[PDB]
Point group: D2
Chain length 116, copies 4
C-alpha cells in the first residue's frame, strides 16, 4: 500500500484499535476533498486506503480521530483530532507510513517514507 | 496570558526561533476564523496572543509553520505545518500552554493546562 | 519473538538501520548481566534476541546505541544512548516491542505489550 | 543554574509534581557516582541541582523516578524509571534543560541547550 497509518496507545501500551482515520486531498480550488477513510485494525494499522494510481501528487491531510478514541476509554482528552498534513509523491511515487502515538493530552507523529 | 505557545527544535537542541504561529477559532458555519498570530521569540515562546476576555470556550486551532522553519535552516521537512486542534473548556484550568517539539519528519505536542 | 526492538529516524523519515542494541538483566546481586545484543535491520527492526524459555521474569535494560548511530550520519548528538528499563514477564509470559524514535537532541520511546 | 530538569504529564496535561530525580556523574572506574537530586516542584521543575563550578565536562545520568509517580496516581506503568545520559561539553551552550514528557507506557525527552 502506498499509504498506511499506524496508531499506538501510550497509556495502555497497545495498538490503538478502532481509530477512525479520514484522508483528504487539497483540490485546485484550495478546498479539502475527501480522499479515503477507514478504521485501525486490532494491530493498530490501517491499510487499503488507496492505490498507486489514485495516490497522485498533492497535499494530503490525514485526520486521526483521537477524541472519539479516548471518549470510549473513559478519558476526556485534550485534542479534537491529530492532523498530519504533507505533500506526497512530488518526486514520483513513494510509500508513506504515518504513525501516531497517543496520550490523553499529547501525541507524537512521524512519517516513514520509502522509495519502492 | 491564558494561551501560550512554546516550540522546541529536536535537531539543534534549542528553542525554535522566529516560527510563525496562527491561531484560529471555529465559527458557527464550521469555518476557521483568524484569532491571533505571531512569531516565536528567542526563547521559542509566543505570549500575548489573547486575553481572558477574548478567549472564550470554543474549538481552537494552533497552526505552527514548521515547513518554513526547516527550509530557513536548509533542511527538507515532511509536514506542511503542525496543527493542534482542541476545545477550550471553562471547567478546566485557566492557562493553556501548547508545546511542540519539532523534527524534520516528526513532531510531538502536549498541552500543559494549569490554574 | 518475545522481545523485539524497532527504531525510527525522525530526521530522515526512515527506519534507523544498523543501530546496535544491548539488553541486560538485573542479577540477584543487583548488577546488570549481559542478556542479548544485536543490530537493527534495513527495516529498523531487531528480532531474535531471546526465546520464551530464556526470557524469564526480571528487570531488563534495553540500551540503544544512538550516539554511534548519529556519529555515522555527521551529527554530533546529545545523548550517549537511549536506555529503556522495565520489569518483564511478572504476570506470566508477554511479548514486548520496544520502539524508539530518534532525533539528534531528543528521543521518544514506547512499549507495546501483548499477551499471546 | 547550568542544569535544570522539567517533567510533564501527558495523561493529565500538567506538570509532573513531586517526581524524584537523581543525577549521577560517571567516575573514572565507569561507575555512576551520585551528583545531585531533588523532587520536582509544583511547576514540574527542579532547579538548584548544581553550580557552574561543580558542573564540569563529563558524562551525566539523570534518572527520573517515573514508576513511583504513576503508582502514586494509581496508574500501572511500564518503565522502572526514565534515564537520560549525556555528555556535558564546554564548547556548546552553557545552560542545559533536560525535559521529559511522561505517559504510562512511553516517554519523550529532549535537551534545550542555550547561552
Ligand atoms: C508551561 C511551561 C513549559 O512547558 N515550559 C517548558 C520548558 C521546557 C520544555 C517544555 C515543553 C517540553 C516538551 C518536551 C518533550 C519531550 C515533548 O515531547 C514536548 C511536546 C514538549 C516546556
Ligand atoms: C508490536 C510491534 C510494533 O508496535 N511495531 C511497530 C511498528 C512500527 C512503528 C512502531 C512505533 C512507532 C512510533 C511512533 C512514534 C510517533 C513514536 O513516538 C514512537 C516511540 C514509536 C512500532
Amino acid at each position: 500500500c502506498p499509504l498506511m497509518v499506524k496508531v499506538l496507545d501510550a497509556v495502555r501500551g497497545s495498538p490503538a484499535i478502532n481509530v477512525a482515520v479520514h484522508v483528504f486531498r487539497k483540490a485546485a480550488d484550495d478546498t479539502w476533498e475527501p480522499f479515503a477513510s477507514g478504521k485501525t485494525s486490532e494491530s493498530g494499522e490501517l491499510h487499503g486506503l488507496t492505490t498507486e494510481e489514485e495516490f497522485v501528487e498533492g497535499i494530503y491531510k490525514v485526520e486521526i480521530d483521537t477524541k472519539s478514541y479516548w471518549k470510549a476509554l473513559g478519558i476526556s482528552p485534550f485534542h479534537e483530532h491529530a492532523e498530519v498534513v504533507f505533500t506526497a509523491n512530488d518526486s514520483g511515487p513513494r510509500r508513506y507510513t504515518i504513525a501516531a502515538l497517543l496520550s490523553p493530552y499529547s501525541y507524537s507523529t512521524t512519517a516513514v517514507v520509502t522509495n519502492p
